[PDB]
Amino acid sequence: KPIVFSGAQPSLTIGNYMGALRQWVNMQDDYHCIYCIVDQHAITVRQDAQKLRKATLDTLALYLACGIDPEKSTIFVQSHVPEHAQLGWALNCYTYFGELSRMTAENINAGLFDYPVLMAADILLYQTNLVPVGEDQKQHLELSRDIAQRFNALYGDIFKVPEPFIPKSGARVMSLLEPTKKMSKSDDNRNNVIGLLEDPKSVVKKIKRAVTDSDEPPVVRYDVQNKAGVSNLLDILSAVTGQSIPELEKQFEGKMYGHLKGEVADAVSGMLTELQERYHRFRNDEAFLQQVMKDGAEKASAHASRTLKAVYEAIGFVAKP
Amino acid sequence: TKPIVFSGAQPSGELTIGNYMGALRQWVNMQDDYHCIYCIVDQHAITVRQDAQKLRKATLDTLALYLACGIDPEKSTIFVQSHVPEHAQLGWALNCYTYFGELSRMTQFKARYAENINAGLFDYPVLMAADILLYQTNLVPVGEDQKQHLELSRDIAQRFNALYGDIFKVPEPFARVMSLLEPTKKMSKSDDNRNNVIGLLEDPKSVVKKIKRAVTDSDEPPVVRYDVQNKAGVSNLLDILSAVTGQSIPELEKQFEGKMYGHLKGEVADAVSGMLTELQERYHRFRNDEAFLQQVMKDGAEKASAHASRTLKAVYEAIGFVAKP
Numbered sequence: 001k002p003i004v005f006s007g008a009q010p011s012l013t014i015g016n017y018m019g020a021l022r023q024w025v026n027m028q029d030d031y032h033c034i035y036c037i038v039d040q041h042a043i044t045v046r047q048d049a050q051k052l053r054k055a056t057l058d059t060l061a062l063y064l065a066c067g068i069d070p071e072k073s074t075i076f077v078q079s080h081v082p083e084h085a086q087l088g089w090a091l092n093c094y095t096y097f098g099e100l101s102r103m104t105a106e107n108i109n110a111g112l113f114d115y116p117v118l119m120a121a122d123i124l125l126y127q128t129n130l131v132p133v134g135e136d137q138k139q140h141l142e143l144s145r146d147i148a149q150r151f152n153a154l155y156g157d158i159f160k161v162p163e164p165f166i167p168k169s170g171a172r173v174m175s176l177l178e179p180t181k182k183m184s185k186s187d188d189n190r191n192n193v194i195g196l197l198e199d200p201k202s203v204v205k206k207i208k209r210a211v212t213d214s215d216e217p218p219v220v221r222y223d224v225q226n227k228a229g230v231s232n233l234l235d236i237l238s239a240v241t242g243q244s245i246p247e248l249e250k251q252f253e254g255k256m257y258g259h260l261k262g263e264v265a266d267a268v269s270g271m272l273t274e275l276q277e278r279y280h281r282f283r284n285d286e287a288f289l290q291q292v293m294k295d296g297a298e299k300a301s302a303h304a305s306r307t308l309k310a311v312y313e314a315i316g317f318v319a320k321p
Numbered sequence: 322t323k324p325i326v327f328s329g330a331q332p333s334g335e336l337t338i339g340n341y342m343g344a345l346r347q348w349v350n351m352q353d354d355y356h357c358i359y360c361i362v363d364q365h366a367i368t369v370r371q372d373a374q375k376l377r378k379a380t381l382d383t384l385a386l387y388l389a390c391g392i393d394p395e396k397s398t399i400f401v402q403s404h405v406p407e408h409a410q411l412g413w414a415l416n417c418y419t420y421f422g423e424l425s426r427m428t429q430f431k432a433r434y435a436e437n438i439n440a441g442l443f444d445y446p447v448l449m450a451a452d453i454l455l456y457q458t459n460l461v462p463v464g465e466d467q468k469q470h471l472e473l474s475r476d477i478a479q480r481f482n483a484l485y486g487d488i489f490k491v492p493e494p495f496a497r498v499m500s501l502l503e504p505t506k507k508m509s510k511s512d513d514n515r516n517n518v519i520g521l522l523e524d525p526k527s528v529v530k531k532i533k534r535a536v537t538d539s540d541e542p543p544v545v546r547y548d549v550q551n552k553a554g555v556s557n558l559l560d561i562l563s564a565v566t567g568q569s570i571p572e573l574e575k576q577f578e579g580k581m582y583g584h585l586k587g588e589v590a591d592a593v594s595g596m597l598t599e600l601q602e603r604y605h606r607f608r609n610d611e612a613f614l615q616q617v618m619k620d621g622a623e624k625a626s627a628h629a630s631r632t633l634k635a636v637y638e639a640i641g642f643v644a645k646p
């Protein structure tokens with residue numbers, strides 16, 4: 001079973017979920033999946049300390065609510081596993097300054113500059129085979145491959161060289177007000193996105209404002225060139241209900257845009273309400289969250305420590321007694 | 322309540338009699354007055370490539386040498402940096418409270434050469450700040466080459482405390498031995514010309530040979546007189562002898578009246594090499610007792626970790642991490 005590593009920022013849209021996470025939830029027996037809530041990456045940007053703590057627990061409960069199973073997979077909070085920072089320092093010594101400077105000055109903090117090395121350590125600790133990345137993480141993954149190959153050439157094969165996982169994604173979900181732009185969790189305009197915790201009244205409101213077209217009479221037809229918004233609304237509904245585009249075009253024959261939007265909103269919220277019930281149950285049980293964090297960190301450290309031991313032996317450290 | 326003192330010991334090279342007589346010899350006798358911490362910094366060492374087994378051996382060499390000098394593991398905390406994970410943990414965290422420009426203005430860093438150095442060489446001042454701040458250190462006894470590093474640690478501590486309240490203590494800073502063949506240049510652990518240097522582990526014979534070649538002057542006739550400007554060589558040998566024996570410069574001047582530079586060199590070799598023979602005796606017994614060094618490292622890492630973990634827990638609480646359950 002291939003080992004898969006994903007870092008989860010403690011800060012998700014229906015795009016993240018239906019395009020990737022929903023299917024990964026069903027892949028936990030074919031793969032050894034690892035989910036790392038990267039609170040040590042989050043602190044490269046200031047925020048109120050209690051907000052970060054709350055958001056770490058939020059993120060853990062959301063992943064559990066989505067269906068990540070702590071027995072089948074390894075899920076944990078990065079700072080609870082000291083090996084991440086330990087390996088991260090060691091790998092600084094096998095990273096060129098020029099590699100970090102060429103991926104994005106006197107007033108930024110050194111964590112902003114150095115966090116690609118920590119990311120490399122996150123991955124390499126677990127003998128990871130596969131990393132699912134957004135396109136904006138491509139050069140970070142490539143650095144981790146180069147560090148692994150460079151270290152291996154010096155000391156022998158210590159690290160697995162990880163590969164990108166190409167999704168075979170469940171859906172492509174576009175921004176509600178920019179149907180040519182992919183829906184992104186980092187979008188500063190939140191009316192483009194539907195977050196997984198949004199209530200049905202918020203969902204209907206964002207769906208009702210989604211851009212359509214000026215066709216008269218209005219017609220529900222898939223056409224990415226001339227009807228991008230209506231096409232995106234059909235793709236969202238298809239991602240939720242599994243119906244093909246032709247079935248949906250038939251279902252909405254003789255219907256206006258208001259009706260398509262209402263049914264998309266109702267279908268999205270039907271999906272999210274089940275997710276939110278599970279979320280509230282996990283999030284409101286902090287005793288259970290602590291057990292998951294405790295179990296996951298010790299499972300993670302058990303494997304991470306085997307890799308660090310090999311790394312420390314290879315670079316020349318006296319083994320800890 | 323005793324002030325906390327933190328020193329980082331590089332597991333590489335050879336300590337000189339300048340290192341010893343100028344600093345380490347006195348700290349050996351201050352172990353009851355201060356809470357002294359000695360950290361053998363193997364995580365800093367790997368910013369420079371070397372054969373891995375050499376670094377492992379050098380780590381043990383350095384431990385055995387600090388013990389031979391008289392660091393008492395029952396009075397002071399002595400340990401190997403990599404055995405205490407909190408060093409790397411706080412080191413990462415403090416990256417996020419360090420300005421890029423602070424590291425880029427480090428004198429040794431301050432284009433093409435820049436791209437080729439490893440990121441550890443760029444980032445180790447932050448790890449150094451972590452090393453110090455983990456132990457609520459009050460005093461860091463450090464040489465001139467580390468003044469900029471100590472100031473960065475003070476800046477980081479102050480800017481972290483200003484954000485989060487009082488978490489870190491703000492540290493403060495705390496003989497005359499010149500190069501044997503260049504007596505205007507201080508004797509340096511890092512000198513490429515070994516003949517300038519007397520290492521703590523060189524045996525009498527090599528020490529004696531190096532001392533007899535030490536530069537003096539061409540005064541006619543030769544006179545053992547103290548004068549740093551005009552007789553730097555003779556003056557260095559007098560200062561070395563004075564640092565070893567505790568005799569004043571006036572006492573030695575009288576002692577050498579009518580004597581020649583060869584007599585002065587002979588006394589310096591005897592006095593120095595006497596200091597070294599006692600030191601080496603302790604070194605070889607400690608160094609060959611692997612059981613003993615293991616127990617010292619285990620104990621010291623345990624004591625170090627107990628303090629560092631308290632600090633890191635407070636740092637992690639202040640920053641906003643969920644506490645490890």
Ligand SMILES: Nc1ncnc2c1ncn2[C@@H]1O[C@H](COP(=O)(O)O)[C@@H](O)[C@H]1O
Pocket residue numbers: 015016018019020132133134135167169171172173174182183184185
């Ligand atoms: N709007 C979206 N529609 C479909 N899939 C998405 C969307 N956003 C992210 N993904 C998936 O999630 C991963 C990237 O997520 P992120 O890390 O948020 O960029 C990739 O595997 C994508 O297939």
Ligand SMILES: Nc1ncnc2c1ncn2[C@@H]1O[C@H](COP(=O)(O)O)[C@@H](O)[C@H]1O
Pocket residue numbers: 338339340342343344462463464465466496497498499507508509510
């Ligand atoms: N040749 C020397 N004479 C006197 N003190 C020295 C000498 N070399 C090093 N030291 C002391 O050793 C400490 C640190 O040495 P270093 O960092 O190697 O220059 C400082 O307290 C110095 O004063």
Ligand SMILES: N[C@@H](Cc1c[nH]c2ccccc12)C(=O)O
Pocket residue numbers: 005006007008009038041118119122123131132133137
């Ligand atoms: N850089 C990633 C988070 C991350 C940290 N370590 C990782 C390792 C693998 C994948 C992702 C990560 C992000 O911003 O989203």
Ligand SMILES: N[C@@H](Cc1c[nH]c2ccccc12)C(=O)O
Pocket residue numbers: 327328329330331362365448449452453461463467470
């Ligand atoms: N930078 C120091 C070693 C060191 C690491 N951490 C320290 C903390 C305090 C004093 C010294 C250190 C040197 O090369 O000599």
